[PDB]
Symmetry: D2
Subunit: 269 residues, 4 copies
Amino acid sequence: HHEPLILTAAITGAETTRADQPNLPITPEEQAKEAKACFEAGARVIHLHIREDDGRPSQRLDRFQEAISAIREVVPEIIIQISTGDKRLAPLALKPEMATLNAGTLNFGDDIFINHPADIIRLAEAFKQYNVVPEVEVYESGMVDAVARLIKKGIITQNPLHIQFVLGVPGGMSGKPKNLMYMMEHLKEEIPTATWAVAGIGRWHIPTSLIAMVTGGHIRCGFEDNIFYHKGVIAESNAQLVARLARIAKEIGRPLATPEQAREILALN
Amino acid sequence: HHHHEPLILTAAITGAETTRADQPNLPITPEEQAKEAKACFEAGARVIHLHIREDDGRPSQRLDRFQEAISAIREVVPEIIIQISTGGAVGESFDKRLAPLALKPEMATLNAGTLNFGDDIFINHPADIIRLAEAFKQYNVVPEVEVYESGMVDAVARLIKKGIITQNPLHIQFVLGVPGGMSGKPKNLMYMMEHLKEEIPTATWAVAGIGRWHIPTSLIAMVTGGHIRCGFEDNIFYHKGVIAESNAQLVARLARIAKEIGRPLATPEQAREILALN
Amino acid sequence: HHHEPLILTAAITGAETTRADQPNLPITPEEQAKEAKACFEAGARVIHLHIREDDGRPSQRLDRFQEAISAIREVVPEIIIQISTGGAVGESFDKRLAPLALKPEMATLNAGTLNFGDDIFINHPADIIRLAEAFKQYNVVPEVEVYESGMVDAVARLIKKGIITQNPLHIQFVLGVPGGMSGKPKNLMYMMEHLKEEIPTATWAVAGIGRWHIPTSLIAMVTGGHIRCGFEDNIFYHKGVIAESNAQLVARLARIAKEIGRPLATPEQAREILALN
Amino acid sequence: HHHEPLILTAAITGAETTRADQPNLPITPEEQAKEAKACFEAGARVIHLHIREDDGRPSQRLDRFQEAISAIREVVPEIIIQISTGDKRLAPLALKPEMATLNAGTLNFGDDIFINHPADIIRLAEAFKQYNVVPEVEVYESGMVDAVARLIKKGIITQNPLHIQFVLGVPGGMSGKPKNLMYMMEHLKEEIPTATWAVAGIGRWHIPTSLIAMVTGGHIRCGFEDNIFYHKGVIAESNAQLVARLARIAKEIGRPLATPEQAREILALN
Ligand SMILES: [Zn+2]
Ligand SMILES: [Zn+2]
Ligand SMILES: [Zn+2]
Ligand SMILES: [Zn+2]
């Protein structure tokens, strides 16, 4: 609990609605204002999805350019991590430091989140061509082994690789403390040099965050994963969620990573 | 967890993927499957986990083919529990997955989720899992719930809470070692049985260890009260680089280890009681 | 679950901590009462109490226990007093039982022996049984101190034999002693799971000695466990920064619980959870 | 993994087991030598040795240790002798055993206490270095692993790779349930990464500890010191009968037994 802590703010996401969370940033201007407030509260990475003005998900290259440029203008030290979810490669030309790589398929609510093995390989190879570092999203134990297989084949070559555990999806592994303890130990056995962060969906935000705090892990928070500050109490901003984690880190004496330290830990240099 | 509780051995003799090119002893016809089932029962198996194939070796879902295989096995070994799996390969029918449940087998496979599976995807949409679970209740067939990942245990617990899976005690078949799924390393099987105990306290469980995971999963299950599945569906090797000569050879080794450590093999009556088939 | 009430215990003095290392250490009944009131106001619901003579040496004097218990109850009548009746080299075994006649709400019961720094902390199996039987005689609820996995099994065996009959039983894990199990997250996760397997209805708290205070506290926060803090176990607020009071340590835990939305137990809730009624 | 060589240790006599409970208990040097050779032929590569007087009471007599060690070496010179010495307890180390027991801590042990004072652990560890005897470090609890790691850091225990003997199932110590052995091997890997380990499962814990060690790369100790039963309520006929079952299970699963040369290499006895 003395190693620097990297806080990631996943500010918008692809599913969260304004009806449920009226403070959801949707426009590039709103996303830049939120990114600055999050950075000041202690966040060093923004996990970015884009939306159209009506709030529907967007994949428009010009919209990604508008959002990335707006955020970099107000917080140039921020690390931008985009989710682009063969014309889905176009935003990588905007030089994000990182991009999401989903490590597998899972049932996801009353639906299926499909990431075909051939498409995982194709995306991993495209990130290398564009010099973009992967942010590898893992929802289950078997996805760690699948990533280790891609490392052995020389497809995923980033080292130290960064794993983003996403716990609490209906269909995926839950965020109960037993699960996060198992996952970090399993990852240490299978990919010894990998670093990791955890995202705890909804009610799992508090247990995942406090375990990561004292086990050397990093933490992702934000409206993409959780809109509540307390049970039944809507959060006022993503920065409010980041600031609570920063206050707990200050209480226990765990320093927040500087932008330089975050780039070193995540091997972005 | 006690190595004195009866042990149920399941023989998964054919499967949907194993080829004769890799395993020439693979039983594919109802006659071959019946001969293998008798040899497996004599070696200690109490359940046959059955997939059917056409004579050219391709996966089958034909009702008449399931009837031929079930009748052939029951004729030679009426005491064995027949557990059928009703999915097919690319070009399968979804409706044909339900039709063999009408044959009221003692058990049938219920998949608990989707996963990448080798170079492909093994798809089990949440609405289709529910539809199949409802067909099990309609035909009074006991499910054998196949779990490949931690999240599938939570998904099954949700289906119990929703009154979709009403079977109690419920039997979970962990399938470990699939490329894309959870591996069969000892840490994983220990985690899975503990996780299952937390989420579905009355559930029983068995483990299948694909390929090289057959030995670590079997020996851990032996001393933790779990049950064991073996066979050519999951593993074709007796030792590394030594192909198994029959499914009964794999069953017999587990029976010998159980006899060495003093863990009794379940009688057919005990297996039906444990699995709540009466 | 991080929504269940949290019981904070302040172990304010202990048998080993010195004033040379921690000048804010309360040693007299008056000092212990002032600290107990400040800890209660900061969120503590239990005081884990050792007594000392005015020269700072450990005490077992019945009159000294009466002076400390009365002083604390006078200023904070709602707090739960949990006494520890052992002494240092030259202690009396019979004096370990004598304060149970003062009918404290709770008292420490040691579950085993271990090497403890350069010495040995001895608790012979027959003496553990004798003390457990004395708890029943005086209607005192035990606070069972466990330092190793084998001590959980030893307690489960005493329950099976009808020697420890308190149900729900409260286990105090003490992690981080040199000679005992450390407070690393893997260990606390193992211990709560091991306890759930062996004594399913038991409740638990954790004390993390020295550097283990932070990892044990934050894991207990989100696993439904209770937390012990204080100068008996840890004298530092941060690495190389001594704590100014026991209440300073309690208040940090109370602030973290407020941040995450875990309510602090009321005195009534603490007595219900610990089955003191 | 279950392909790494397996070292089987036979703890043939112990300090507590009685002839009343186990009539096949070897007590004399001649009986111990015959049992050691039968165990070696069944697959054992180490003998964990305690000595007794002819009436069966425990012994610490130097001449009795010399008689037992010489008798075993005469009939099975390839076996590794590991003695338990129980401050003139150092005298038998001059008989050049390859290994000797180092108890890593104190614990309640049945209706008694097994005392190993921190200063005495250090004194014994230093003596083993003086006599060039490799320690067999007996661990009964999680905290004993940390205590050993502290002695390594202090330069008191210098053997590397160090061999840890987990002793599970003592009333007062950690039990032999699978959750515990999995925790212990992982805990040891974190705290002493290069250490090797074996497990002894007292009484009913012999089977769960042995089968977990089989498939996790661990080594196994068996024998009348720890367990006298072949099955529940069925007294074993010999220590070699217990060793032979483990050798048969290893053969079934394809785990090779260590040769004497491999056992000396793994245990760093050269
Ligand atoms: Zn995202
Ligand atoms: Zn199948
Ligand atoms: Zn105390
Ligand atoms: Zn011994």
